[PDB]
mmCIF file of C-alpha atoms in Angstrom:
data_model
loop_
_atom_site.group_PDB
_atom_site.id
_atom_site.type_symbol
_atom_site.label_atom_id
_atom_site.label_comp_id
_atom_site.label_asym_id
_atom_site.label_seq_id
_atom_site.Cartn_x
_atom_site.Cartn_y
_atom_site.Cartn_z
ATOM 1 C CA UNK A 1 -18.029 -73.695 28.753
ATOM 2 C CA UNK A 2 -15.157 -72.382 26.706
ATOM 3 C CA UNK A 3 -15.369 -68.815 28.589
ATOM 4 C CA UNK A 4 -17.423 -67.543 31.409
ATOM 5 C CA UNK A 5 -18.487 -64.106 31.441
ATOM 6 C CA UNK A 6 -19.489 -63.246 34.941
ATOM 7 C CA UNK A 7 -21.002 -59.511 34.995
ATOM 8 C CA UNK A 8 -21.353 -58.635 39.408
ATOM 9 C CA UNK A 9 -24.538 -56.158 39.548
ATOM 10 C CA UNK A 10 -23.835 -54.509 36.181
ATOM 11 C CA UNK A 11 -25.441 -51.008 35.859
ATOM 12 C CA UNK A 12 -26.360 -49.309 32.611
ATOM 13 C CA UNK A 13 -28.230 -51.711 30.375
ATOM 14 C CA UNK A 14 -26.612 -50.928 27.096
ATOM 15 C CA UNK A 15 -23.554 -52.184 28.337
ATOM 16 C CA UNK A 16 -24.889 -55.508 29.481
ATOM 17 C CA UNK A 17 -26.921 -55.838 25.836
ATOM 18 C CA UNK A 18 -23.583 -55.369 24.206
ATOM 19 C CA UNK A 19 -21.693 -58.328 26.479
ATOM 20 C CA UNK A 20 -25.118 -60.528 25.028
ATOM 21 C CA UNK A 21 -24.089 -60.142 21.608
ATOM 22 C CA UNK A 22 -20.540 -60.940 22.211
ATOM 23 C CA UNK A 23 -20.721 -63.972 24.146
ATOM 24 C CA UNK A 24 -23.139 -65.187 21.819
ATOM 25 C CA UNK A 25 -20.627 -64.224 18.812
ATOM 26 C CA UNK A 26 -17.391 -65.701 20.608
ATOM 27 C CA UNK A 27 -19.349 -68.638 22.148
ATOM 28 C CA UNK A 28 -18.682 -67.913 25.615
ATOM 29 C CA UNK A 29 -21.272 -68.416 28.510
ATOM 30 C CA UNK A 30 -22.747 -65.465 30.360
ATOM 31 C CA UNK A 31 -23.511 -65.121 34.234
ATOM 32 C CA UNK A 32 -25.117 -62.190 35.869
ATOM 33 C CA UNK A 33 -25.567 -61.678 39.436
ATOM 34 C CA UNK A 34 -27.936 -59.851 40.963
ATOM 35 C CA UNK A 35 -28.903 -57.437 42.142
ATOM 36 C CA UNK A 36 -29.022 -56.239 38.419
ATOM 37 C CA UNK A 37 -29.187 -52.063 37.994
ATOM 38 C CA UNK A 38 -31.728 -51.889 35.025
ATOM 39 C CA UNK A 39 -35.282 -53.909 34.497
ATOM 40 C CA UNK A 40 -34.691 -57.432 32.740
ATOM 41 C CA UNK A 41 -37.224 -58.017 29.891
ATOM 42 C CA UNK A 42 -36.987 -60.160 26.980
ATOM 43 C CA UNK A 43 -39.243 -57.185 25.650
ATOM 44 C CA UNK A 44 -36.504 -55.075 26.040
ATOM 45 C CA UNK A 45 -33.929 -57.003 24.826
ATOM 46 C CA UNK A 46 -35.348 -57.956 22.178
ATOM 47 C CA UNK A 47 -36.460 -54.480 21.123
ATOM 48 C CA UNK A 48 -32.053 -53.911 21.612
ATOM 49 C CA UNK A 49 -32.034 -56.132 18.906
ATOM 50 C CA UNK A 50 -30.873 -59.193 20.682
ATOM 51 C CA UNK A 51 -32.435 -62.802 19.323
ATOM 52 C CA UNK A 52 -34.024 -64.966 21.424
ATOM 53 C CA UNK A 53 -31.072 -67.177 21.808
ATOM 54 C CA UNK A 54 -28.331 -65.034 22.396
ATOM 55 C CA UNK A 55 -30.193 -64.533 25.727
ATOM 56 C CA UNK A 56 -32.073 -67.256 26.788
ATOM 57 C CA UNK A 57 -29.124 -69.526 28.138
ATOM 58 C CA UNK A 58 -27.255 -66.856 30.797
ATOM 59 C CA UNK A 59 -26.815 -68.289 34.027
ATOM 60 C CA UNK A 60 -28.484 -65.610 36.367
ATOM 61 C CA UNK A 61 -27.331 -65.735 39.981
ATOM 62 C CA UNK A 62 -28.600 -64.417 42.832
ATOM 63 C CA UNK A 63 -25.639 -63.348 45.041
ATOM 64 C CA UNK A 64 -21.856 -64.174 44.254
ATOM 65 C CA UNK A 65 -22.193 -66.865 46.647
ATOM 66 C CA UNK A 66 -24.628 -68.744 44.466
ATOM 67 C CA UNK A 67 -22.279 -67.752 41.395
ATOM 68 C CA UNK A 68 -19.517 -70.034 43.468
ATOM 69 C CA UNK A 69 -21.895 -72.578 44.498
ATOM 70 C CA UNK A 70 -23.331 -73.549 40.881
ATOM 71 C CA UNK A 71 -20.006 -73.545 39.395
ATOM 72 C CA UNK A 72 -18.759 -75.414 41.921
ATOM 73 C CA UNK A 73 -15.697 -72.754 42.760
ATOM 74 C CA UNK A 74 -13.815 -72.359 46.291
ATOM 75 C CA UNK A 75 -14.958 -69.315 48.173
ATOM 76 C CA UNK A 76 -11.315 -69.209 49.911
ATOM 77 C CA UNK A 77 -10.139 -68.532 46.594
ATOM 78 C CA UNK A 78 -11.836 -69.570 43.015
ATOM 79 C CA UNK A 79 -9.237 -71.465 40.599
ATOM 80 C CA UNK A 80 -9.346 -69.945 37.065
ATOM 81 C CA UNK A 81 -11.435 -67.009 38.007
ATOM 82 C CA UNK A 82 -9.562 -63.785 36.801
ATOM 83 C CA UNK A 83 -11.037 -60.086 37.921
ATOM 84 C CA UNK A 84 -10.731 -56.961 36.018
ATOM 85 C CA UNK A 85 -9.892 -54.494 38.725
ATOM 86 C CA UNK A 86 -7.712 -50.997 37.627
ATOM 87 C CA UNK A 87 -5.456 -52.221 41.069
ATOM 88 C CA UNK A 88 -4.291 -55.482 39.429
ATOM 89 C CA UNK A 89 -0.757 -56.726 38.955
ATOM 90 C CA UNK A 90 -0.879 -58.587 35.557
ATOM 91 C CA UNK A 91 -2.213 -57.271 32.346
ATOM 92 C CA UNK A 92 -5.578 -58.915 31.397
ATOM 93 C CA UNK A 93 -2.795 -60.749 27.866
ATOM 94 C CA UNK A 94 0.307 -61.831 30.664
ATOM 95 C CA UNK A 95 -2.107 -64.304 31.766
ATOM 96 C CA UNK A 96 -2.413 -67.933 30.201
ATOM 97 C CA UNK A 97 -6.469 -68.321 29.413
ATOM 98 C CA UNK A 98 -7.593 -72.034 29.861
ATOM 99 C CA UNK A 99 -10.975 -73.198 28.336
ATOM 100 C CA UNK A 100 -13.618 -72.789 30.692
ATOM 101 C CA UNK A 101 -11.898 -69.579 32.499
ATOM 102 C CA UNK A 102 -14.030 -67.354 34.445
ATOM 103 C CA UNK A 103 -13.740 -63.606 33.834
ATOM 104 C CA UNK A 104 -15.090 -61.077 36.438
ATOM 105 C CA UNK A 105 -16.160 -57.931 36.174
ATOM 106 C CA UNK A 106 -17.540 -55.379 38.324
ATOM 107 C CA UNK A 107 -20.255 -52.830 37.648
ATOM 108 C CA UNK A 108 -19.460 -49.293 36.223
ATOM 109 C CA UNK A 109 -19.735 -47.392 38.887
ATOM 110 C CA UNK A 110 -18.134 -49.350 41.127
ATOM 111 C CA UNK A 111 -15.731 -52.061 40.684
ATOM 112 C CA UNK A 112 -15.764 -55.336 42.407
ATOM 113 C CA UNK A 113 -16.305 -55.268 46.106
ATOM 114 C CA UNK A 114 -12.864 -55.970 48.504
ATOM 115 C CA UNK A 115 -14.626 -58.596 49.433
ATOM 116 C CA UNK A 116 -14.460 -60.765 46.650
ATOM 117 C CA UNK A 117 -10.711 -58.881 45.476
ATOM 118 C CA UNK A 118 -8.872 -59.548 48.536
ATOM 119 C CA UNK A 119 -10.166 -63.170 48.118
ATOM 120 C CA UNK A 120 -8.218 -63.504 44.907
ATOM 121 C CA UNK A 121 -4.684 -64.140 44.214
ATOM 122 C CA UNK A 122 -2.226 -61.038 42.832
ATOM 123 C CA UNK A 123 -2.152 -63.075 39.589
ATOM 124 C CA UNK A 124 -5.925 -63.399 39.315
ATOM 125 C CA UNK A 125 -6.675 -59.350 39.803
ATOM 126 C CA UNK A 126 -6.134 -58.595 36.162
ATOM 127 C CA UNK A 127 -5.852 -55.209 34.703
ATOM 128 C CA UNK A 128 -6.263 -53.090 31.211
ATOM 129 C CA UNK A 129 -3.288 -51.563 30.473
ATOM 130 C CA UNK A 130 -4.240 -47.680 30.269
ATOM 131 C CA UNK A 131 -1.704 -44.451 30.361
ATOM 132 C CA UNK A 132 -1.405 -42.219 32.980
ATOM 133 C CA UNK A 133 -4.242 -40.783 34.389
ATOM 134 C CA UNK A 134 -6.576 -42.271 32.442
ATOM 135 C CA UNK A 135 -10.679 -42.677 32.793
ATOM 136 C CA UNK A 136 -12.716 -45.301 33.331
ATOM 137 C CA UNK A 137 -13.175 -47.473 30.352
ATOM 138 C CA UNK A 138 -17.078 -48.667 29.015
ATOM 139 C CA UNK A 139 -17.652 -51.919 30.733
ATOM 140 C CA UNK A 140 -18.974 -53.888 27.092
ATOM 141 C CA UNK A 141 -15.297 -52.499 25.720
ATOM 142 C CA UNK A 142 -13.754 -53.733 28.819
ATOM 143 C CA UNK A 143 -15.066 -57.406 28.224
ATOM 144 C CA UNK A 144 -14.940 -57.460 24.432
ATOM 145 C CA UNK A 145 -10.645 -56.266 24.797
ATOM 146 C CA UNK A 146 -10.744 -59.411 27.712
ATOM 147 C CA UNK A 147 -12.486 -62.223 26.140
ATOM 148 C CA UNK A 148 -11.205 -61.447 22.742
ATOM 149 C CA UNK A 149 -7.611 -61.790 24.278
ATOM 150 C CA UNK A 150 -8.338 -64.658 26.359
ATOM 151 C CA UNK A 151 -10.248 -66.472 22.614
ATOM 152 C CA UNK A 152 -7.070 -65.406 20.411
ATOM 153 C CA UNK A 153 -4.651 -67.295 22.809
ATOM 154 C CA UNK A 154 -6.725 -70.573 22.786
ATOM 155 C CA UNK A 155 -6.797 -70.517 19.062
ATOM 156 C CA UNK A 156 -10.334 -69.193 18.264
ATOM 157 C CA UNK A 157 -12.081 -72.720 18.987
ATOM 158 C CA UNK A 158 -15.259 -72.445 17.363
ATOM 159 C CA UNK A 159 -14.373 -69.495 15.371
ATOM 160 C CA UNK A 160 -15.888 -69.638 11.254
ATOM 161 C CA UNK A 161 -12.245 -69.864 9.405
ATOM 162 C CA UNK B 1 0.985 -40.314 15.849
ATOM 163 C CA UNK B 2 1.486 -44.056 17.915
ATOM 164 C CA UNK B 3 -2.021 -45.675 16.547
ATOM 165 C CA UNK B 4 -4.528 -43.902 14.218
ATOM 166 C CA UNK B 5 -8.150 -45.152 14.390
ATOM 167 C CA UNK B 6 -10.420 -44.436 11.721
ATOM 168 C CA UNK B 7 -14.090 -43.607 11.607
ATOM 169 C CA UNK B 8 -15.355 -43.423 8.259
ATOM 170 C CA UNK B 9 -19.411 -41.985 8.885
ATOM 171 C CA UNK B 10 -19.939 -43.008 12.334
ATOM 172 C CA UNK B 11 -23.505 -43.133 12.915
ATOM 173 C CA UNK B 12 -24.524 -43.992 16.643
ATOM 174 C CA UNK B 13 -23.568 -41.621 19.231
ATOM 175 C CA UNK B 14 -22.515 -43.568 22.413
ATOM 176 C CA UNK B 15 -20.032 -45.217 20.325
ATOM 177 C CA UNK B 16 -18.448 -42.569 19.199
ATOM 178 C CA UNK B 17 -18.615 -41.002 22.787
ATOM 179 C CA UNK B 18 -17.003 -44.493 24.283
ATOM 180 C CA UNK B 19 -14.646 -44.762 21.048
ATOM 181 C CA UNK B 20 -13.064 -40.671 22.036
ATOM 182 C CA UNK B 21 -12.262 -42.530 26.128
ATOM 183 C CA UNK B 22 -10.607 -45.295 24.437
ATOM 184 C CA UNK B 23 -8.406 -43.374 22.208
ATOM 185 C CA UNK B 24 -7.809 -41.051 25.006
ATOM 186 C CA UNK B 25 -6.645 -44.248 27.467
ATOM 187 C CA UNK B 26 -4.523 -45.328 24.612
ATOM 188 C CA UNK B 27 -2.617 -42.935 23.162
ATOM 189 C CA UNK B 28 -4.394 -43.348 19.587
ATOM 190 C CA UNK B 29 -5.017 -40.131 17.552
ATOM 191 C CA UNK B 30 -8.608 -40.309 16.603
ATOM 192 C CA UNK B 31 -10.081 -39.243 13.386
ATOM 193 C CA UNK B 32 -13.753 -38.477 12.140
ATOM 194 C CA UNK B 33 -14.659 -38.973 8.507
ATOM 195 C CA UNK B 34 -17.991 -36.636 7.913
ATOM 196 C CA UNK B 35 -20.528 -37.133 7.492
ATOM 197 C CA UNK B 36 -21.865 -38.111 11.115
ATOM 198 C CA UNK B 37 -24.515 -39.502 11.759
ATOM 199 C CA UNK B 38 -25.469 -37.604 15.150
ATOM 200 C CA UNK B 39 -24.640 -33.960 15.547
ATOM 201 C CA UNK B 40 -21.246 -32.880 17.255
ATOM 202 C CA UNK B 41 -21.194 -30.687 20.350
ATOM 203 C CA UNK B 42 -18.846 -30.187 22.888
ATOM 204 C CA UNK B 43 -21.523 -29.544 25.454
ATOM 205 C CA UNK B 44 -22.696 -33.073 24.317
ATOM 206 C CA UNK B 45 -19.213 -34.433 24.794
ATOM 207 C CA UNK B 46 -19.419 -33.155 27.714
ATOM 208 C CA UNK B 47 -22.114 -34.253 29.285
ATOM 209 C CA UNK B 48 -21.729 -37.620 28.446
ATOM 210 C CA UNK B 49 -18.799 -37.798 30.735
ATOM 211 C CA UNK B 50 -16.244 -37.047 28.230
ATOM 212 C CA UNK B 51 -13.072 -34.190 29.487
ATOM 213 C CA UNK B 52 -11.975 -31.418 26.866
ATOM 214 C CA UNK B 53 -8.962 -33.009 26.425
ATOM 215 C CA UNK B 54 -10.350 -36.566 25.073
ATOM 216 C CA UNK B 55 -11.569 -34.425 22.053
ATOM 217 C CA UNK B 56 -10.351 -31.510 21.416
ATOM 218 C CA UNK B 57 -7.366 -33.403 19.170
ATOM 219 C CA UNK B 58 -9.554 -35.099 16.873
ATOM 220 C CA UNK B 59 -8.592 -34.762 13.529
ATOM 221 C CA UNK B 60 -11.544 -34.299 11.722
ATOM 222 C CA UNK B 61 -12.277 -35.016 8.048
ATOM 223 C CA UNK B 62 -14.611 -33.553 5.258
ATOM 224 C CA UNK B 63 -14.646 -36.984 3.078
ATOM 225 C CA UNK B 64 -12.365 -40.029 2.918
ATOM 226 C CA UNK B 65 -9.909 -38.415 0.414
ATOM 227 C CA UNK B 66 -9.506 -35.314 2.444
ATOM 228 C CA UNK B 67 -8.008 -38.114 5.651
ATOM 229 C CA UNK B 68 -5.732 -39.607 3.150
ATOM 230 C CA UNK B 69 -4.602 -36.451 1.496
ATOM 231 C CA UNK B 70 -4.095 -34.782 5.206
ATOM 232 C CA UNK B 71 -2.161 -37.991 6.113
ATOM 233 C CA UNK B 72 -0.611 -38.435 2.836
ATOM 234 C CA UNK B 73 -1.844 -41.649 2.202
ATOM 235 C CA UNK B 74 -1.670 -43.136 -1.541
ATOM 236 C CA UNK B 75 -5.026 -43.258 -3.043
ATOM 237 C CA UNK B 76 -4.775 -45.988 -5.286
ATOM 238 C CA UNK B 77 -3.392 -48.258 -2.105
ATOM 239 C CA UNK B 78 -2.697 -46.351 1.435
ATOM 240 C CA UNK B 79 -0.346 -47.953 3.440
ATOM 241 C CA UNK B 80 -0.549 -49.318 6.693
ATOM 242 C CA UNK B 81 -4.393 -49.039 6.756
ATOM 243 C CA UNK B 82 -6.032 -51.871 7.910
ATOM 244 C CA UNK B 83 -9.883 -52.220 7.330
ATOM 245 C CA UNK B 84 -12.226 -53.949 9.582
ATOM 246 C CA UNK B 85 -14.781 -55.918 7.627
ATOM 247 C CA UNK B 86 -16.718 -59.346 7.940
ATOM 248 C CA UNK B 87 -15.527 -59.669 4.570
ATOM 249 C CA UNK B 88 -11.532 -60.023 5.126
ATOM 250 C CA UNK B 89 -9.092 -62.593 5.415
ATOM 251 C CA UNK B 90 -6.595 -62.098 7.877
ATOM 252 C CA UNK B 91 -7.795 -62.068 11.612
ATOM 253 C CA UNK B 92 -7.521 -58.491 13.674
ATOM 254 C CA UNK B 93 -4.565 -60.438 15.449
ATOM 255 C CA UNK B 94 -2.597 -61.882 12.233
ATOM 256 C CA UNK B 95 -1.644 -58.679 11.068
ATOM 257 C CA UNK B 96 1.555 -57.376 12.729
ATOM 258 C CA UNK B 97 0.824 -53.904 14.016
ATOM 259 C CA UNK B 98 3.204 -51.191 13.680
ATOM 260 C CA UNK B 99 3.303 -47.487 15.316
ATOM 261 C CA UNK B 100 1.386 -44.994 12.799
ATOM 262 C CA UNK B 101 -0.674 -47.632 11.443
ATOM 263 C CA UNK B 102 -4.237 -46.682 10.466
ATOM 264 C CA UNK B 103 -7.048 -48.428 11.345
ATOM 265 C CA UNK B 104 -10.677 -47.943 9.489
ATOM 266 C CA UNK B 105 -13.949 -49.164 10.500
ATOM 267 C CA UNK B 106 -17.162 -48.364 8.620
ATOM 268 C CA UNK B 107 -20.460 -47.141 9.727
ATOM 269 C CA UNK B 108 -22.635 -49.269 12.169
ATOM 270 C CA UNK B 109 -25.504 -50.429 9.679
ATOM 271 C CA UNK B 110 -23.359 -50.310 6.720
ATOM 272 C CA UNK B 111 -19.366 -51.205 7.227
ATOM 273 C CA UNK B 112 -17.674 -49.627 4.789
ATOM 274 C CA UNK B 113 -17.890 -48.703 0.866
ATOM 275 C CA UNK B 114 -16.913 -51.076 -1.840
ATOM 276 C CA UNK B 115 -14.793 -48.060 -2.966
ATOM 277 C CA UNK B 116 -12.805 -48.223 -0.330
ATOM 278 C CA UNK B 117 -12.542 -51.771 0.608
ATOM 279 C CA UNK B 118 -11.856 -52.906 -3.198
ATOM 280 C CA UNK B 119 -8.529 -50.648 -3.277
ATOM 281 C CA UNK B 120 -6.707 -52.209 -0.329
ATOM 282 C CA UNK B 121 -5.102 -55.559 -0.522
ATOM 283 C CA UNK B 122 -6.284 -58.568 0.714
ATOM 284 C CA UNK B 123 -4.054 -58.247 3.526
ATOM 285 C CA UNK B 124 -5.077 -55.024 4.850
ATOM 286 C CA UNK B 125 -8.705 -56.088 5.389
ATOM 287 C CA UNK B 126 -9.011 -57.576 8.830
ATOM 288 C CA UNK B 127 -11.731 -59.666 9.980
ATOM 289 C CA UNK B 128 -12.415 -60.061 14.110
ATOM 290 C CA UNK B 129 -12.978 -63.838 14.726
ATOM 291 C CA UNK B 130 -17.164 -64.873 15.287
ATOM 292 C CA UNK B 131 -19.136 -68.007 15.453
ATOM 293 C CA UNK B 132 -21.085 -69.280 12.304
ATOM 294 C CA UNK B 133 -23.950 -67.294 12.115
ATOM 295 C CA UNK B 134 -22.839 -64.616 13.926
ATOM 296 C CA UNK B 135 -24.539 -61.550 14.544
ATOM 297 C CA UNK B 136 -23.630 -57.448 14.179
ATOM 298 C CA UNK B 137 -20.787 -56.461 16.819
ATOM 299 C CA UNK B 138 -21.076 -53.223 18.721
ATOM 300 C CA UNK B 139 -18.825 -50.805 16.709
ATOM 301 C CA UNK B 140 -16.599 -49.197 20.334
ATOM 302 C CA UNK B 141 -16.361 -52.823 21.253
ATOM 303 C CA UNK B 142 -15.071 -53.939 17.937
ATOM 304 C CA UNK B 143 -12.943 -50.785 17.660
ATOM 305 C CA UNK B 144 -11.388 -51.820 21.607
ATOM 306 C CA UNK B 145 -10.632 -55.388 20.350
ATOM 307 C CA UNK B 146 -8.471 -54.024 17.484
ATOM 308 C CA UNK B 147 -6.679 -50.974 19.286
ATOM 309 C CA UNK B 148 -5.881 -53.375 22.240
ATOM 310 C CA UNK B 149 -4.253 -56.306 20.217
ATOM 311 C CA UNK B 150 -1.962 -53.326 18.219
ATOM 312 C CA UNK B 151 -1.289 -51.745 21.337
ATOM 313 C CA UNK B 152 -0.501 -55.372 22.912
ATOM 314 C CA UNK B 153 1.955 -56.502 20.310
ATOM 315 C CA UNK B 154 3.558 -52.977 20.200
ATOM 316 C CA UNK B 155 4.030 -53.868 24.319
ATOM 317 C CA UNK B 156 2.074 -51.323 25.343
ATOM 318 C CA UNK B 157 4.239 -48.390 25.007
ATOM 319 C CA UNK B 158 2.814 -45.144 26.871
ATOM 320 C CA UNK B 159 1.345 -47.552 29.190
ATOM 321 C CA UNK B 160 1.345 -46.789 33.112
ATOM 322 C CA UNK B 161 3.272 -49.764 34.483
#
């Protein structure tokens, strides 16, 4: 893959429609691991206004541990694997993208679990630069700021010029 | 102002709603070109998470000549307004942002008016990087990509560090 989107139990379902269309207009692959917080239809989704193929070729994933295991990642500590968490060191553009980077995101409401943060390197616990006391950002915006940044830095393989 | 982002007829209201958190994070002065196309209440804002402060500095327009005469902006060419449409030539990122610059985006099911678009120069009309055959990206998402490669090659002034 040139990116890899990897949503952990995202929430609200507009948000995780939104990440569809983007990965499918940046060509990046989508993962979503379970337990999901909204009913998965292609009903639905395609009543969104998603086509067919935007999502018929996300990797679903039922736990993180099967996330690791089909991508074939170290649990200790997954190379190229970068988490947006508010309580990172690096801004999501002082890190170097690679193709075939994995970029993690928590659900809305939640973040990612310390489990699976205090796993990761400082310099893989990436955050969004925001001013002082600031609010939580939407979760699609979140992704789109991430991936674009990660897409402009490799060049914009794939990209119509 | 540090950024200005531009909403010429915004039509959808979570975007809008999502659009006011991201200018708030940022430090960008948001502005509303009327008509909307969902009705404005602050108990609306409100509820949908958003703080009297997010809004309560939007500059608000009656039509697009009103925002250029308020920001006096030449008609026959306003400078430092960038335009987001499929249709440009320069990429969101190839432009080099300055503080103060304005940045438009059209309506969700429209983009913006030939009017408008066929007054600025070719370099002023941006174009975010998609696939061949790409399809419509969400507007807050779009309007995040832009705001946060300014704000990155300004280096994030106003930023928490």
């Amino acid at each position: 893959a040139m990116l890899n989107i990897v949503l952990f139990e995202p929430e609200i379902p507009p948000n995780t429609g939104n990440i569809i269309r983007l990965c499918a207009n940046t060509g990046c692959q989508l993962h979503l691991i379970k337990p999901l917080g909204f009913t998965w239809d292609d009903k639905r989704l395609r009543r969104a206004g998603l086509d067919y193929h935007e999502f018929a070729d996300i990797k679903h994933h039922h736990d993180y541990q099967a996330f690791l295991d089909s991508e074939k990642l170290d649990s200790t500590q997954p190379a190229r694997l970068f988490a947006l968490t508010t309580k990172g060191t690096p801004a999501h553009s002082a890190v170097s993208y690679q193709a075939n980077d994995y970029l993690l995101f928590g659900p809305e409401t939640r973040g990612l679990p310390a489990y699976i943060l205090d796993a990761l390197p400082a310099q893989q616990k990436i955050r969004i630069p925001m001013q002082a006391d600031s609010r939580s950002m939407n979760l699609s915006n979140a992704v789109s700021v991430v991936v674009y940044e990660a897409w402009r830095q490799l060049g914009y393989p794939g990209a119509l010029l």
